[PDB]
């Protein structure tokens, strides 16, 4: 667990329907919402990679060893019965583990990309902002829609506003 999804983020945005991960902002102009392509594709690329492994078919032909319409000798039938049940017990265990092991890693991977998106933004904002604990960053300079976009564009230049932010933080 990386502490983000169902961790310090209180809940999910049902409103966000264009991505797995996103931004919501607030400034004077108003409030917005956008979705982050990179990180969602990272997560969905890793899911669809799992599903291909799932669907790798392995073509081993099998014939019939127990008749459906005729009598089979009692002793060989109990041997076939024991073997076949034993293989099914194996494959039932193998499937149930597979799904449980995969799901655990699917959840936590989805968690990590959220925390990787969050971390990138924190490092970008630098000393011009502070974390509020609920996954938000409080910014100490005016940031208009074209600036908020530069945070999502990954092109936000922290040194531009560094003078104004630092003065607001310290008073």
């Amino acid at each position: 667990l990386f502490g983000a999804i169902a961790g310090f983020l209180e809940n999910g945005w049902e409103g966000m329907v264009d991505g797995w991960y996103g931004f919501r902002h607030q400034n004077a102009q108003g409030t917005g919402q956008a979705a982050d392509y990179k990180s969602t594709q990272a997560a969905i690329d890793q899911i669809t990679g799992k599903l291909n492994r799932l669907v790798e078919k392995t073509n081993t032909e099998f014939e019939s060893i127990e008749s459906e319409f005729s009598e089979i000798e009692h002793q060989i039938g109990n041997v076939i019965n024991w073997t076949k049940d034993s293989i099914t017990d194996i494959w039932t265990y193998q499937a149930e583990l597979l799904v449980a092991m995969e799901n655990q890693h699917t959840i936590d991977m989805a968690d990590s990309e959220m925390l990787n998106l969050y971390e990138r933004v924190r490092k970008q904002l630098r000393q011009n902002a502070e974390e509020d604990g609920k996954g938000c960053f409080e910014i100490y300079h005016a940031c208009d829609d074209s600036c908020m976009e530069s945070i999502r564009n990954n092109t936000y230049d922290h040194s531009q506003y560094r003078e104004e932010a630092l003065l607001n933080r310290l008073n």
């Binding site: 983020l9 991960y21 032909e61 319409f69 499937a95 149930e96 799904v99 959840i107 908020m148």
Partner: protein
């Protein structure tokens, strides 16, 4: 002025198991176990034989139900419920092993033994247990030999089949077990009866035995069927003086095919690789729960109704 971060959620989120939690709620999930199949036998792309009435054994000895299936080529062979092998009541030694072999074959070809009998033998016994076109008849590849004059001792006769081919042949014969002393005497005489068969790989003796039995297909008598493989270049000889149901043609199984026992109707439009009693299975999933007995290239049968695989993140609603 602040920018927030977060993730999507949905109103109805599917539940999946995890290593530590069996009630985990997730945004999306998909099935790994196939629970539906095709109630047809998808035989497209396959040269196939539907035998219907014919039991695979019936093919070698020529039961009338099998007249359409005496020789063939196929890559798939289908046996149907309640197929008929025996017109005249009988049993075959190592029956399952032979049936399995035919089901593994990719065809049958028939070769005449070439047997000929003197004037004392009647090669053409028939019965109403083996009807063929409103007419009494007999297994098409075997000949029932009886004395021509009733009650007279069947003559001591020697018959040899030589396999002059490059591959093994499957020869079959029967031993007739009469239902009464009267009938045994009428058919073969009062003499003591012995039948001995042998090749480089087979030696045996058989003796018809008279005992009373329940009627099956109206008959109290029986025929026991026996078989052996006759290698290329080898000979098999029958020494007998009453009671041999002798082969008039031998068989040759050819190549390899997939045998299928099924209740399903054939469908030549769909194509598939996995089959069972109920029909065919076309799927991408590694597991299934339709049948514990499948055939072909199939997913692995698991003992679970459903196993769901997460396609999304944890679902935390708004």
């Amino acid at each position: 002025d602040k920018i927030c971060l977060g993730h999507h959620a949905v109103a109805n989120g599917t539940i999946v198991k995890t290593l530590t939690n069996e009630q985990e709620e997730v945004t999306n999930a998909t099935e790994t176990v196939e629970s539906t199949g095709i109630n047809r036998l998808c035989m497209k792309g396959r040269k196939h034989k539907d035998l219907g009435n014919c039991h695979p054994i019936g093919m070698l000895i020529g039961t009338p139900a099998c007249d359409l299936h005496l020789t063939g080529m196929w890559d798939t062979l289908i046996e149907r419920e309640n197929a008929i092998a025996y017109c005249y009541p009988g049993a075959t030694v190592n029956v399952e092993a032979l049936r399995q072999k035919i089901m593994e074959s990719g065809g049958i070809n028939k070769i005449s033994t070439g047997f000929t009998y003197g004037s004392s033998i009647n090669s053409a016994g028939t019965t109403r247990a083996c009807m063929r076109n409103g007419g009494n008849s007999f297994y098409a590849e075997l000949k029932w030999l009886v004395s021509k004059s009733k009650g007279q001792n069947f003559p001591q006769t020697t018959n040899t089949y030589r396999n002059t081919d490059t591959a093994e042949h499957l020869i079959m014969w029967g031993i007739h077990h009469p239902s009464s002393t009267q009938e045994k005497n009428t058919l073969y005489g009062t003499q003591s009866l012995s039948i001995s068969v042998g090749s480089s790989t087979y030696r045996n003796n058989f003796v018809p035995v008279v005992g009373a039995r329940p009627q099956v297909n109206g008959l109290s008598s029986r025929i026991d069927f026996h078989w052996t493989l006759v290698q290329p270049g080898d000979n098999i000889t029958f020494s007998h003086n009453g009671g041999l149901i002798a082969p008039s043609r031998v068989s040759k199984l050819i190549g390899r095919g997939l045998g299928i026992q099924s209740d399903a109707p054939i469908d030549n439009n769909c194509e598939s690789k996995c089959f069972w009693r109920g029909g065919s299975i076309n799927t991408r999933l590694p597991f299934q729960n339709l049948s514990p007995r499948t055939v072909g290239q199939c997913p692995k049968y698991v003992n679970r109704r459903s196993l769901m695989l997460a396609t999304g993140m944890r679902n935390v609603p708004e």
